[PDB]
């Protein structure tokens, strides 16, 4: 039991580090959305008065 | 896309922008100055009105 638990330890340590980067990536997409919506809405208003 | 020339443009209200475009196309101040007769006429008006003042 001791050896098998020790052997599986490296896998958890390495692909935890794998998870960490993808978190920040999806956060960056969540940032990218909003300012795209606001440029859309201001463009629509200017078009309307045209 | 960080200079203030971009900045005021998206801080413009739309109708003020369009009025700027229209009166930009219209060019009233240039016509009034370019016309000789009315220009020197209004020069005479203000000059001898000033002369009547003091």
From TrEMBL, chain A:
Chief subcellular location: cytoplasm
Gene Ontology CC entries for this record: cytoskeleton
UniProt keywords, alphabetically: Acetylation, Actin-binding, Coiled coil, Cytoplasm, Cytoskeleton, Muscle protein, Phosphoprotein
Compartments, as annotated in UniProt: Cytoplasm, Cytoskeleton
An annotated Gene Ontology molecular function: actin binding
Subunit structure: Homodimer. Heterodimer of an alpha (TPM1, TPM3 or TPM4) and a beta (TPM2) chain.
Family affiliation: Belongs to the tropomyosin family.
Protein name as catalogued: Tropomyosin alpha-4 chain
Species annotation: Sus scrofa (Pig)
From TrEMBL, chain B:
Superkingdom: Eukaryota
Location in the cell: Cell membrane; Cytoplasm, Cytoskeleton
Subunit (UniProt): Heterodimer of an alpha and a beta subunit or an alpha and a gamma subunit.
Family assignment from sequence similarity: Belongs to the aldolase class II family. Adducin subfamily.
Free-text function comment from the UniProt entry: Membrane-cytoskeleton-associated protein that promotes the assembly of the spectrin-actin network. Binds to calmodulin.
Name of the protein described by the UniProt record: Alpha-adducin
The organism of origin for this protein: Sus scrofa (Pig)
Span of the entire protein shown here: 40 to 93 of 754
């Amino acid at each position: 039991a001791e050896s098998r638990c020790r052997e599986m330890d490296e896998q958890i340590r390495l692909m935890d580090q794998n998870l960490k980067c993808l978190s920040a990536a999806e956060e960056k997409y969540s940032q990218k959305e909003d300012k795209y919506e606001e440029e859309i809405k201001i463009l629509t208003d200017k078009l309307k008065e045209a | 896309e960080n200079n203030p020339e971009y900045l005021r443009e998206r801080n413009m209200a739309p109708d003020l922008r369009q009025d700027f475009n229209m009166m930009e196309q219209k060019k009233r101040v240039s016509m009034i100055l370019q016309s000789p007769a009315f220009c020197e006429e209004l020069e005479s008006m203000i000059q001898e009105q000033f002369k009547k003042g003091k």
